[PDB]
Amino acid sequence: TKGTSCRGTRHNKTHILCKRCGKRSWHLQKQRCASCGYPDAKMRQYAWGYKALRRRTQGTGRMRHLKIALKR
Amino acid sequence: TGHKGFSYKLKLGKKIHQNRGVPQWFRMKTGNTINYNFKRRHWNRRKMGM
Amino acid sequence: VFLCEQKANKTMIKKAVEKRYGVKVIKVNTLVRLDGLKKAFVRLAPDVEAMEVATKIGLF
Amino acid sequence: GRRTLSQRKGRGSIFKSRSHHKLGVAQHRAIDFFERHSTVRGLVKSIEHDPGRGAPLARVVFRNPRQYGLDKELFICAEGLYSGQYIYCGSKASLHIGNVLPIGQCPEGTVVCNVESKPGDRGIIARASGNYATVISHNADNETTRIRLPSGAKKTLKSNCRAMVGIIAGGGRTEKPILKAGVAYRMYKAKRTTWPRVRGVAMNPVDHPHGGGNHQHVGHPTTLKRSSPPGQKAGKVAARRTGLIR
Amino acid sequence: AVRVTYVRKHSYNTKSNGIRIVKTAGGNMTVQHRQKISNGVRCGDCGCVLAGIRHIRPHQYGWLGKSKRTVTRAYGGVKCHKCVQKKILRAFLINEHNLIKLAAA
RNA sequence: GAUUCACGCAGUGUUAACGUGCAAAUUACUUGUCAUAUUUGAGUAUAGGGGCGAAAGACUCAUCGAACUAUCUAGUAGCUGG
RNA sequence: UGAAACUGUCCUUAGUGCAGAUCUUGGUGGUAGUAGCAAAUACUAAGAAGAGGAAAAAAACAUCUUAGAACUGAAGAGGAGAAAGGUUCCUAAACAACAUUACUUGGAUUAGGGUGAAUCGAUCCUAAAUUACAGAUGGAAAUCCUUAAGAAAAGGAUUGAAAGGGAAUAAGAUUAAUAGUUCUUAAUCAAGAGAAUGGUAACAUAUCAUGAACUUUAAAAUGGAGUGUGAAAAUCUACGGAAGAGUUCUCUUUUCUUCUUAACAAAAGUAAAUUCCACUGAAAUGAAUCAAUCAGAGAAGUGGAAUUUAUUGGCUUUGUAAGAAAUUCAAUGAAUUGUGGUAUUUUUGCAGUCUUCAUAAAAAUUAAAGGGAAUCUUUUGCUCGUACUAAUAACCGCAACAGGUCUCCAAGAAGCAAAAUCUUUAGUUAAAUAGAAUAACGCAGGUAAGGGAAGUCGGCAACAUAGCUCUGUAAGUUAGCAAGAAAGAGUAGCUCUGGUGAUUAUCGAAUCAGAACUUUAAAGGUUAGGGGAAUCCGACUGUUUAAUAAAAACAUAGCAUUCUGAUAAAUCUAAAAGGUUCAUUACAGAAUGUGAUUUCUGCCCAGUGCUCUG
RNA sequence: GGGAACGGGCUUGAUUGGAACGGCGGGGAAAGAAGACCCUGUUGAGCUUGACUCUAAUUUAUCAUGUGAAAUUUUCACUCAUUUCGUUAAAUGUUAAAAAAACAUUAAGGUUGAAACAGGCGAUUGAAAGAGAUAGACGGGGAGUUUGGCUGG
RNA sequence: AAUAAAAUAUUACUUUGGAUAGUUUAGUUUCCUGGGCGAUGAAGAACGCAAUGAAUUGCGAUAAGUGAUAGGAACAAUAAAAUGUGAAUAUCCAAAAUUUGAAUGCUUGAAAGUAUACUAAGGUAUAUAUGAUAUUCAAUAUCCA
């Protein structure tokens, strides 16, 4: 019963959306985000996660105020 | 659920709003390749993970 | 039945409806739709006829 | 190998004390002037059952000697105390059952319980059900007295340590034979998670040092030095004797 | 036999989710939310339930008449009439004894 | 922590069905059990030479005599294939 | 064929020549019109719409209405919620794809519509637990501490429950869909604005009838079992009718349906149980329960007080309120809406009894007391959730998967029974396609002459006993059991008789026993123990390898051994005014072996351990 | 028959009409899976142990300067770092002067009423213990690794 | 012995598939110049804004855009309006800049919220550490009348 039957009771969320990164990686019982490293001030980045760095970093968003400054 | 937070309901409403197709007039523009929205999903076809 | 900004409460909606249309409001019921708009149900005083206000607004 | 269950007990994750319905901390009132140069009178309002311990606890109510109000204590019941009784604590208290006196004002051969090992520490020794300590001798030279601990050991204490006269209630608790595994299950309702104890020999070599082979046996002596590292310290530690006694 | 449904969104038979099925017009049965059972006051000494005070919820004594939550007697509403008689005798008899014991015995 | 039946549960036997299945462990009858060492929801605690185990090396997201994931890493191969 | 670039020679350069690597990526065959589209009892007739039942029976035809026949059988295939899903809800147009045939159907395509709260919840409080400033620790990241270390917080900070606690809303109607939320009517709550009498006493008086600091008490707020009983609802039933429907060639003064009432308040009439008060003082001891249990620190008796009994005050009754609603009749308008029960079940309280080496939460918040400091009308009630499924099609399993997933309401028959079986209200007739033929071999359910385990590793599988009543019951035994031992007899239908009560002859309860007569000689439609004599293991109830082992394995109580005076023992951590047993204290904590009870545990200290006061 | 010693193909013969339907289980050394038994590899992993080499924890000695004595270097006496505790840091020190389950508070200019002062909040331990460094012992609790070859397997 | 249904063989044409050929608003590498963010709130995330938009793009309650400076007649899928009295377009400029985020009055889960002061609503300020100055204090800590 480790296969099909045991999947029926899965109706309790472990992660929900995080306030800082918008992903569903906020652990409800650990009170921290698995992806962006919430309340920790620094963003969670690792050298072994090089793809994770090229997915969310500088230049992946709007750059509302930095696009004018560097252009200036 | 029946009970939901305020912000969570608005992110549910936006998912409803984005499940629409290309309007006909947009398809008649010159040099147009966008015919169907490939970001479409249905409640019984794919769960949106939120 | 109006559509208002979600950041407005029944107290400000009641004042705004009176100010904009010069009527009397005795009850406001609001619900926030899925899209994001706050639908308001405004009931006017018995001596104010709502049907004539609709024609002035443009619904008729 | 793995970590034995003895090692896992020191972490305190599922082995924490089940102290939710406990009444409080059973101890004497804090030492002050009126307990050192006079007497305070306490009223035994009620006798109650504290989960996880065999002796009943008494709710004693002293008046506040310095301010206006009450001062609610929680003593361990001496065998004989009743509701509505008056008990007196202090250096001048009479030698009646239930009264708290400094250990130096008690005659030789007297019986005390809830003794203080160090003055003002509100009770350490002789606290279990039916247990008591007996005063052996005094020494006015250095103001120290000797008492006999319930294990037969003799201990020397400062003569101003407080103690309650009498015997802790609930004697004979362990003389009734448990009969069912269910009854032993209910004993640890307000205690730690230790009851169903699997024999080490029934385990596997990874889990325990006793985890045996094709026959359930230990294979090496079960008497170990005190300096054994945790994990291999299983059996009898620093044992000077074994076998049955004649 | 008419079968009913929970009106509120509670779905479990907890103490606060007690219901009573009453009958209404046309043979329809509706659902009433019934209150919990409270306890009355107790004497501070003997722990016996006092007489003359109703067994209602603590906030409901605010709606009670000012004379319907206490008994017109010294230590009324906190002590039984027997709890008070012994108080008077203790106060008087002990003071009398302390007048012959000390004060020119 | 008596004997049983029932709502449920389990999984003794048929070593029945099925075995490119209803199903990556299910079905039918039979059997056992069916409230105090009971059954169960939500919350909460315990994390990889760690935890948890009425102890089977069992369980730890279909993964366990050491999980999953990424990096060192195009690890090394006197061996096999081209 | 194709329609804009390309070729020869010499040198130079190389990501330069493929049949293989279970090679990589893509495309495609035989298999093959083959295996299949067979769990969930079941559909038929007439009509409508539609291109879509034609025809030499092409034997089948999706959707909707009516009729017939059926199934889930009220612990449901019913009516509603929590998690999860997220627009799947409703309507209209439309069917290319999808739901193993088809579809006019759809949880599918397109486009609009839909979720209304002072009273329901979140918001508020704290529980297990969780996280901050300063401090402590660490090379570091960071860890510790949660009131202890602080010039911090009258006293201890943050979070933590849509099942724990909590101020206050009900009935009817209404929408294609929301409704304790809208409408009508009727209420409630919070925040406001405009130094008293009576009673012997228990105690009592539409606000009344002052009551600060400070302190205390109580409530919120507390297990389970089993027995008795009050009350309501449901079912059943008695009397009395009103209205409508069914049967009626054979009868039936007959069978069936309706005869209702909210929140909040009032107080004609009137209950059960418990606890107190006054008079008096019990023995010739009384009183009382199903059981108990109680009495000179005072019984029974009489007279009182109080509280509980789903809102005021439990039931009837009353305002609400008949104007509503239900059942009929007429073409909007008219008719009625008594009284009971020594029956059963459920719910809800109450009363004492039993049980624990188990004693079965806290805060927000409220009231009262001790004390004596001081001298009716009207306004407002903010933010957020609210649609729908909640499952043999909306959830998790790749899916419209026979698997899994927490709850509430709950009719008749029959029976000990919430059992099997059949029906009522509600729901549905479709839920991976049919038609013809009726071969072998299969899957599921059966029967059998004579014999009766001769089959086989093995009575595997099947057969067989089976309810109730009476009689009767062995060895063995821890004296409790074995025991439903084993064994034997009875049981139907019809017509009668007697026993078991209440009020002063009438009224009611299903239960037991007995007697004639008849027959197909009677538990058996369904449900429903095979029995006996021994041996081995485990004492027992219990747990176990999710997915080949449920056991003789683990656990268990019992027995025993070892260490420890708490600044300790065990033991987590890199460290730490750090952490666990420990809210603890030898009848305790920690570490082990054996495995109930009875009986007995023999000899050996040389070796290896451990220890020593040497 | 021979062949890698059990051919559908080769050699010699027996014999053959093309397409197939329902069954069936002899063969296709049928399918599923880089044999899981055995061996080899200077390939591993779990577990054990006085296998080799180490290590956490435990333990022992020396160093790390509190005063004041006394002996022949432990042996003591104090507190002053230090250890362990307790409270609302709530009368410390020295002078002066068991009859009763009830109540107990906001006192009749500014000092008495309610005594003054100590340079110690109250105890406990104590120059020893603990942590550090170096050195010996113990240490499968744990880490790494190894466990020759030939051989009628 | 016999037939060519099936089977086989070649070519042409069609079909399934997308190789080959032609092609490039895309990449790779080297070199040159810089290496110009943030409490005056960054990077990132969310939500919202077009006459008809779902994504994407641009932008922020002044919204696929405003003012100013250059610029000179367009846009287009379909309508409208405005337009040489200045349409598209560009910019190191000006105004404006929702919720968050180091996120900083307090709380934050998917949480709706909320206290004080200043200037009913609206807007500012209030985290921790920290330098300088001013000011109010605490300690018989050192003296001292």
UniProtKB/Swiss-Prot annotation, chain D:
It holds the Pfam family Ribosomal_L2_C. It comes from the Eukaryota. It is found in: Cytoplasm. GO terms for cellular component: cytosolic large ribosomal subunit. The keyword Ribosomal protein applies. GO terms for molecular function: RNA binding; structural constituent of ribosome. The keyword Ligase does not apply. Keywords: Cytoplasm, Ribonucleoprotein, Ribosomal protein. GO terms for biological process: cytoplasmic translation. Coiled coil: none annotated. Residues 206-246 are annotated as: Disordered. PANTHER family: LARGE RIBOSOMAL SUBUNIT PROTEIN UL2, RIBOSOMAL PROTEIN L2. HAMAP family: Ribosomal_uL2_A. Belongs to the universal ribosomal protein uL2 family. Component of the large ribosomal subunit. NCBIfam families: PRK09612.1. Component of the large ribosomal subunit. The ribosome is a large ribonucleoprotein complex responsible for the synthesis of proteins in the cell. This is Large ribosomal subunit protein uL2.
